[PDB]
Structures are given as structure tokens and as C-alpha cells.
Amino acid sequence: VLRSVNSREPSQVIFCNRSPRVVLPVWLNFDGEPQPYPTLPPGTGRRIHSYRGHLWLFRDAGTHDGLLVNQTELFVPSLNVDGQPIFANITLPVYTLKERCLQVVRSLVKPENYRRLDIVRSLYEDLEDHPNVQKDLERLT
């Protein structure tokens, strides 16, 4: 369902990482498989060659936490006007306090030890159910 269209019409894009995370751009290929691309350090940008109708999303490279691009989940390169590239502004979401706490806890506790934490079983499940692109594709479908 969610997949890039094989349009063959070039579109030049700037991936602009305005987050404090290392960014993993993910291209959804013509069969809908996520293809990872080179990472972007915090605050950096890359001018890249993509195509109209192609689908992209953006993740924290280390944790797979979800990021926004032009304020939304998916970015689709448009027609370039006057030879100008399309800007893809990658930013942090306003995470819920719960998701933000899960992130921090996941960053300090090796997954084998989630179970040693003194919390209700459902929070163990929340920790183990870490962000993943496949899960988000099944949702977004």
C-alpha cells in the first residue's frame, strides 16, 4: 500500500536535520520495503537526488524514535519550481511525556534488564515495544 511511485521525474531535495538526533532517512521502495540511507549528524544538511512520488520518513539512527519532516510523518518530493530544491525540514516531535521517559529509560537500561525494573508489567511491555519502522508502516496502513 505505502510505496514510492516509479515516476522517473527527478526532484532535488535538501534533507535538513534541525533535530539534536543522528538522522536515518528511510526510502520506501517500489514494493514498500524500507531502505535505509546514509545518516545525518545533528544540525547538518545534504542535497540529494530523489524523484517525484517517492516516499520518505526519518528516524533517530540509534534508537529508531520517530521524527517529523515538514511537520508530518511522510515526505514526498514535489516538482521543483525555478530549479530550486524542495526543503525537507527534519525536526523533533513534541513527544508525550511517557514516550520521552521510555526513551530515556531505554537509553540507560540494557533490554535484558527491563524485567528487573520495579514497574507494572504493562510498562515492561511498553519498554520492549521500542520504535520500529515496520510497526509504523502497519499503523499508517
Partner: protein
């Protein structure tokens, strides 16, 4: 302006905009102008209030969003509170 009082387990009284506290569906339920939290100490509830301000300020805003900071020492308790308050 309408404020509400959120009181920590150790007796610290946090006064915040009603609108901000309604971020939390649990707090909304506890109001329908003061709520006592017997399990949430002040080092946690103070951060919860800071989150409300942060959320209201940065929700639907194109100005770059900074990371919401959480010290390791409070992360577990803050997680538990966030789960209770559904925020």
C-alpha cells in the same frame, strides 16, 4: 486567568494554568481546584509542570523544537507518573 493547585506527596504546592493541567485526562477527572498526589514527590511533579509548559509552547509551532530534558535519576519515577497521568 484560571489556575489550579497540584500538591505533591511531600506537600509542595504547584500552581499552574488550569489549561495546562488539563493536558492530563487523569487530572481533568480529578478536578471533575486542588488535587493531591500521594505517590508523586515534588522532584517529579515539578518536572511534570515543566512538561505542560513545554508542550503548550511547542505544540503546532515551526520554530525548532528543543529536546525535553530528563535527568537519569528521575526518569523511572517520571515514567510512572506519566503513565498514571496519561501525558
Amino acid at each position: 486567568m484560571m489556575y489550579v493547585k497540584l500538591i505533591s506527596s511531600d506537600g509542595h504546592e504547584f500552581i499552574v494554568k488550569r489549561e495546562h493541567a488539563l493536558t492530563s485526562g487523569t487530572i481533568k477527572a480529578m478536578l471533575s481546584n486542588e488535587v493531591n498526589f500521594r505517590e508523586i514527590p515534588s522532584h517529579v511533579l515539578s518536572k511534570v509542570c515543566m512538561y505542560f509548559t513545554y508542550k503548550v509552547r511547542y505544540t503546532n509551532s515551526s520554530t525548532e523544537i528543543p529536546e525535553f530534558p530528563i535527568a537519569p535519576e528521575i526518569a523511572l519515577e517520571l515514567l510512572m507518573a506519566a503513565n498514571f497521568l496519561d501525558c
